[PDB]
Structures are given as C-alpha cells and as structure tokens.
C-alpha cells in the first residue's frame, strides 16, 4: 500500500508540474518571432579538409584559441589539428582504441579521451620531454563513457553509460560528486558558460539540469520520444538544445521549465548525432545520419542551410569560440572546416 | 614559398606524423578483428584461456595471423548505442552453452540474443562463428530431462547426435540473410584443443570471401 501511496503522490506531483508548465505557457516562440527578419540561405563552403584518420571519427572538440582542435577515431589515434594550415600538431596513440569522446582543456594544456574501456584518460600536451603523456586514468564508471568536458585543469565532468554523470578531481583521481537520477544511459553533456551548471541527455528521452556544487538534479525536461544523443547550451546559458533519434531537435528553456521549439521536417527521418549553436545563438547546427548537416535559425523552425559533403554519418560537430568556423567530423574519416 | 622556417619545419613534422599514421594503419589492417559475444553463464572463459573494464581485448598470433578478440560481454549497457562501433569486424564468435536448455529459460534467451545480433543492421555481411559449448555434460544432462522441456516441438530421439544437430539447426534457422553471411558452427568442450583451428579456418574462409568481393570475382 505504501508503494501505491507514493506512486499516486508522484503522479500528483507530476500533474502539478505539468499544470505549472501549462500555466507558464502564454505564447509560443513561433508567435513572437513571426515579425523578425528570416535569415538567408546560409551558404558554407569547405575551407579545409583534415584527412589523417583511417577509421570512423566519433568526436571532436575545438580549442579556446579557435585554431587547434582534437579528434578521436577508432583507429586508435587522437590527433591535434592545426585548422589554419592543416598540420597535425600531435598524434596520441590510445591504449584502448574503442573511444567515443574527446575533450580539449580550456587552458590548452590537457586533452581528455574515453570510450568503451570505462576510463577517462587525461593526456598532458605540454611536458619537458616533448611528447604527449597520459597523466591520469579516471576509472570509476561501470558503463561506457559518452562525453567528457573540462571545467579547468583540475576538474572534469564525464557522462557515462550507467545512467550516471560524475565530477572528477584530476590530482587525486576520485569522483568528487556523483550525479544520479537518469534511468537510461547518458549520451552527452554540455557545460554552462559559467562553469556551475551542466545539462545531460540520456536514453530515457529526458534532459536533466545538474548543479555542480551541491550535486543535485535541479530540473528535468521531457519532450522527446526517443534517445537524446546530443545536447548543447545556448550562449546565454538560459537555454539548451537536444538532438534525439526521433529526427527532431528541441529548444528547452531553464527558467520557463519547458520546451520552446521543435526543429523537424517531414523529409527527415534519421537521428541527430550532434548539435551546436552559433556565436550569436541565432543559428542552430545539427549533424545527422543521412550524411548531412542542417542549419536552422533557432528563433523559427525552418531549415536555412545544408552542409552536405560527407559520405557517411556526421558523428560530431563543433562551432568554434570565435564563430569563424564549423568543424564537422564523420564516419568517412574526414574532418571539414566550414565557413 | 611564403612559408617561414618554423612553418616549413612544422610541415615536416606533420609529414613525419603522416608517415607514422600510414605505417600504423597498414600494420593494423593486417590483423583479424573478432567480436566475442555470448549469453549469460556461457563457457567463453574456457576457450579464451585456450586461445591465450568494459572491453577485454585479447591479442594472440596463430599461423601468422594476428587475432584480436574483443570480449564485450560484461558491458552491461544498451547494446544499440555502441554496437555500431564494431561495424567492420572480420567475424563474430558467439558462445552458447548446450547444457543451458533446462536451466523464459537460458536457451531461449540465447536464441533471442543470437537473433538480435545476427539480423542486426550493422552486421548484414559479417560471418558468425558459433561455439556450442559444454557438450560433455550436456550429453549426460540429456539422460533424464529431454529436449521437450526446451523445445516442445522436438519429436526426435533423446540421443546426443540428433539433439545437438537439432539445436544447431534451430540456431542456424534464425539467420534471415542466409545468402550474404555464413554461420560456422563447432561443437566444443572444456577439454578441446582444436578451438583455435576452427576459428582459423573460419576466418580463412572469411578472408577468401572478402578477397573475392574485392578482386571483382563476386
């Protein structure tokens, strides 16, 4: 009887959360932005083509200086790229070739990498010996690592395949904070501009807002019908966008506690693998399974550009911090810089 | 050529990195990548010990082939989110205990897992090697407790040489794409030396098949 009592109590709390979100819904984002100027056809050409991987590229990440980027592929290699002159700065041999994520530290000193070995490896780029070197192996998960992002040189947050995000300490090597509450396994995370909150999308069609200091789940966003594969904060930090396997991108909202737009089209039936905003937050970039990359303006759901040019699934995407470039990676073992 | 001296030396560093990447890739392309699967309480540890925390990789050489098995049974996550990483393996070794027919039951779970990996969208052209393991105490477990417990449609005798072939035909009938891939099958035990010779012959036929596809002969 106690299980049914708390069951009905949780139903009543979900009903009052739904009633609060319905009472806050006074006008949609389509009804307000019907008077702004629609953006033109965003024509973007392949400036650089980075061709050094020999297997499927699963993740990339930009540097803070908007010139260096790292990319992870399952040929067992992790390559630092000079995006201006197409030079390979470093080539990092991985102990486990089955990697699914990579991160570039905002100081530029470190590079993270992880995957199906349940280990976030931290690589030191700037040593006295001249070579790259693994500094720490953060081994505390039981599921596969799906995303990792540095807070600073000493703190990193990882999302894993065991319905659990974790906050690490690089110097000691243990989990400072464990973030639990998802029921499906978490596929991506995204830090806020002020490194105090992060969102995470899992395979239970829910995205949760996490507080890094206290370690609690603040808000929970349910609008999708399938597994959320990618997530990214808006540049304001008051919104984020998710990309799922139901061929839709959705713009959620932290203060309004519910979704705003759905970025969908009837000719699109494949899942989103990657999502990123522009520098202004006006454009919304999204990588697909039908080998393309589509660009919506975020203020109105209409597709304003197609970044076609890959021959397999666009698995990773990054808009740089200057907004000058978009690096798209794919399973055809090529990175492409778009502008 | 409008490059500085450090730019030219950085290009030389990048070209040396390119040479190392090409050498490592053409070394890695000479290796046989095997995906090791199986149901719960399988006897895969015995044949791994014969052939020798998410993926237990196992590198071993045999008759100038460099095999690398990837024991991924133990990755307790949603398999649909990471099974596309193994697109391009040479074969798949799938381990079934034959004595798990009485312990739905374990054998129907094995059939469901084999049907899930065999008809998967990422392994349409991948051959599957199938060790039907623990055949020794299966042969004495079928003394009492007949196969009607597991397969009630079975009407043959309670002997070993018919029931084992019936279980083999029930697993091989789960293949929907019978034209593209093959299902190699071996009755194995714990004390069985020839478990590496069978996977050697099976990947030899798979390499010959891929070479017939590559050389235009198919």
């Amino acid at each position, epitope marked *: 009887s106690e299980l049914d009592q708390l069951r009905q109590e949780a139903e009543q709390l979900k009903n009052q959360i739904r009633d609060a979100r319905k009472a806050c819904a006074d006008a949609t984002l389509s009804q307000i932005t019907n008077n702004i100027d629609p953006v033109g056809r965003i024509q973007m050409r392949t400036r650089r083509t980075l061709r050094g991987h020999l297997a499927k590229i699963y993740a990339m990440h930009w540097g803070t200086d908007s010139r260096l980027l790292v990319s992870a592929s399952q040929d067992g290699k992790l390559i630092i790229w000079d995006s201006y002159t197409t030079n390979k700065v470093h080539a990092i041999p991985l102990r486990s070739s089955w990697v699914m994520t990579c991160a570039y530290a905002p100081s530029g000193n470190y590079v993270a990498c992880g995957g199906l070995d349940n280990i976030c490896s931290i690589y030191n780029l700037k040593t006295r*010996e001249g070579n790259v070197r693994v500094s720490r192996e953060l081994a505390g998960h039981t599921g596969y690592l799906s995303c990792c992002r540095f807070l600073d040189d000493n703190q990193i947050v990882t999302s894993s395949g065991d319905t659990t995000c974790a906050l690490w300490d690089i110097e000691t090597g243990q989990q400072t904070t464990t973030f639990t509450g998802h029921t499906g396994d978490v596929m991506s995370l995204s830090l806020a501009p002020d490194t105090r909150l992060f969102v995470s999308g899992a395979c239970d069609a829910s995205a949760k807002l996490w507080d890094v200091r206290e370690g609690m789940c603040r808000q929970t966003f349910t609008g999708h019908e399938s597994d959320i594969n990618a997530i990214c904060f808006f540049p304001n930090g008051n919104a984020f966008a998710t990309g799922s396997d139901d061929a839709t991108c959705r713009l959620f909202d932290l203060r309004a506690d519910q979704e705003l737009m759905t970025y969908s089209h009837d000719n699109i039936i494949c899942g989103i693998t990657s999502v990123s905003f522009s520098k202004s937050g006006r454009l919304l970039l999204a990588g697909y399974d039908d080998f393309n990359c589509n660009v919506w303006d975020a203020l109105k759901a209409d597709r304003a550009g197609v970044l076609a040019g890959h021959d397999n699934r666009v698995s990773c995407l990054g808009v740089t911090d200057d907004g000058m470039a978009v690096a798209t990676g794919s399973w055809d073992s090529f990175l492409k810089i778009w502008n | 050529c409008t490059l500085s001296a450090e730019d030219k030396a950085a290009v030389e560093r990048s070209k040396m990195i390119d040479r190392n990447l090409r050498e490592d890739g053409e070394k890695a392309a000479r290796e046989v990548k095997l995906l090791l699967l199986g149901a719960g309480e399988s006897g895969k540890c015995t044949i791994v010990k014969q052939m020798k925390t998410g993926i237990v990789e196992t590198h071993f050489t045999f008759k100038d082939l460099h095999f690398k098995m990837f024991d991924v049974t133990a990755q307790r996550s949603e398999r649909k989110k990471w099974i596309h990483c193994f697109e391009g393996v040479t074969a798949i070794i799938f381990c079934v205990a034959l004595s798990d027919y009485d312990l739905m039951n374990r054998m129907h779970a094995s059939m469901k897992l084999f049907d899930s990996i065999c008809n998967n969208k990422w392994f349409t052209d991948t051959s599957i090697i199938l060790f039907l393991n623990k055949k020794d105490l299966f042969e004495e477990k079928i003394k009492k407790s007949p196969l009607t417990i597991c397969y009630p449609e079975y009407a043959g005798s309670n002997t070993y040489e018919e029931a084992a072939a019936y279980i083999q035909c029930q697993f091989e009938d789960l293949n929907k794409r019978k034209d593209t891939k093959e299902i190699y099958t071996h009755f194995t035990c714990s004390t069985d030396t020839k478990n590496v010779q069978f996977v050697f012959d099976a990947v030899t036929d798979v390499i010959i098949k891929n070479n017939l596809k590559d050389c235009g002969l198919f």
Partner: single-chain antibody
Framework: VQLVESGGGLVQPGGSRKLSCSASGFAFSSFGMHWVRQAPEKGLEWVAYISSGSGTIYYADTVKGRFTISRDDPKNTLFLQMTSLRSEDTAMYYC??????????????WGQGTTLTVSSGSDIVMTQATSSVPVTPGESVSISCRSSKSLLHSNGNTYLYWFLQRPGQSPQLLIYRMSNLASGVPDRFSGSGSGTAFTLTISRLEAEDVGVYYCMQHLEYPLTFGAGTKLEL
C-alpha cells in the same frame, strides 16, 4: 633533461675532430638539433642544424662543405664531424634542442658545451647598440635591438628570440617569440617590439639575472645572433 657535449681538446690546424652530444631525459627523435658556437671572447653564432628524422640539414655558409652534422636516433647521441679545422674555429660548442610545431618553444634547452682549441652577404644582421649596461637591483632595464629586414612574417608571427647566458654557464631561453615568455622563467622579463625594433624589459632585477643577453632571428636561415648586451654590478 640534459645534454652532455663531449669531444674537444687541442687540435692542430687542418686536422679533424668529431664532437658528440649524448642526449638524456627527453624524446630525442622528435627534436631538431642545432650546434651553436661561441668564440672565447666574442658572442654566439649558429653553426648547424639537423631536423627530426634527418630530413633537413642546414649549415652556416662559413662551415658549409667543411663540417658534417649527423644524428643517431636509437643511441641518443648527436654528432658533428669536422674536417679541415682552421684558426677561426676555436670556440666552445653548444648543443641545443629545438622542436617546431604550432605554439612550441624552440631553443629552450642548451647543452653545457665542450671546448675546442686549435693551435697556431644576404643575411639578416642583428644589431645591439649597448655593449655593457651598468645597473643596480630593483631598477627596470629596457634593452633594445634592431634587424636588417622586418622579422614580422605574413602569418602574424615575429621571429625574434631573447636568450640569457649567466657567467660561466650555458645560455638559457628567455623569450621564444617577440612576446612569448618561456617556461621556468619569471614574470619580470617581458619582450615587446615591432617590425625592425625590439625591446626586452626587466621590471625589477635580482642578483642572478646579470650576464650577457643575446637576440636571435629565426625568420631565415642562417640563424644570426647579435653582439650581446652585458649587465654587471
């Protein structure tokens, strides 16, 4: 990380001698290597360079066709084969490692160097006006230098390096571009400048940063140093 140069001694003029530098403590195979000499009363001048993997070998148009630089990758030594030693080759020969990628610090570690004693045009000219500057600690010292052509390359980088040679020690890298501070170097040192005119500024001094400063260009080969500025008292 260390570089021990060996060989040297008294050599009759017109003879031959091979110098070795056994590297220890770093990835030797991924570093370009330079030999840079220093006359017993004069400053520094570049001699030879071999790249990583021995792909590019440069000489100084004074030893070209006369010295031979070679490196060994498994055994970590660096060789400089010298034939036909004239009287203008008596110096202490320093070995210095140098990596080149985007954002790297070339010329960051210098060997201790060994002594060699012999018996009996289109380059860029570094020019430092002040030969000796007397100074007290706590002050701020602005040392200037100038070039022949503009060291600002078209890609934005300006290739002027600032070094420091303590009395009785090997030179040390201070500033590894026009304004980039090297590792292990305090925040007092600050490089600046533009075009063909550059200035290293010391905000406040200590006792250990006295000695001779040298400026080097890395825009074009051959690499040319300046007549160094001495700081005493």
């Amino acid at each position: 990380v260390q570089l021990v140069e060996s060989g040297g001694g008294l050599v009759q003029p017109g003879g031959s001698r091979k110098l070795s530098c056994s590297a220890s403590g770093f990835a030797f195979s991924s570093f370009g290597m330079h030999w840079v000499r220093q006359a017993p009363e004069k400053g520094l001048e570049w001699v030879a360079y071999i790249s990583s993997g021995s792909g590019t070998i440069y000489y100084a148009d004074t030893v070209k066709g006369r010295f031979t630089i070679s490196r060994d990758d498994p055994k970590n030594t660096l060789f400089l084969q010298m034939t036909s030693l004239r009287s203008e080759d008596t110096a202490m020969y320093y070995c210095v490692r140098s990596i080149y990628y985007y954002g790297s610090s070339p010329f960051d570690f210098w060997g201790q160097g060994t002594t060699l004693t012999v018996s009996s045009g289109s380059d860029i000219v570094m020019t430092q006006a002040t030969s000796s500057v007397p100074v007290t600690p706590g002050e701020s010292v602005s040392i200037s230098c100038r070039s022949s052509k503009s060291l600002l390359h078209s890609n934005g980088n300006t290739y002027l390096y600032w070094f420091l040679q303590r009395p009785g020690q090997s030179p040390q890298l201070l500033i590894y571009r026009m304004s980039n501070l090297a590792s292990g170097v305090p925040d007092r040192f600050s490089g600046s400048g533009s075009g063909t005119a550059f200035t290293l500024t010391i905000s406040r001094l200590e006792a250990e940063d006295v000695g001779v400063y040298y400026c080097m260009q890395h825009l074009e080969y051959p690499l040319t140093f300046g007549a160094g500025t001495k700081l005493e008292l």
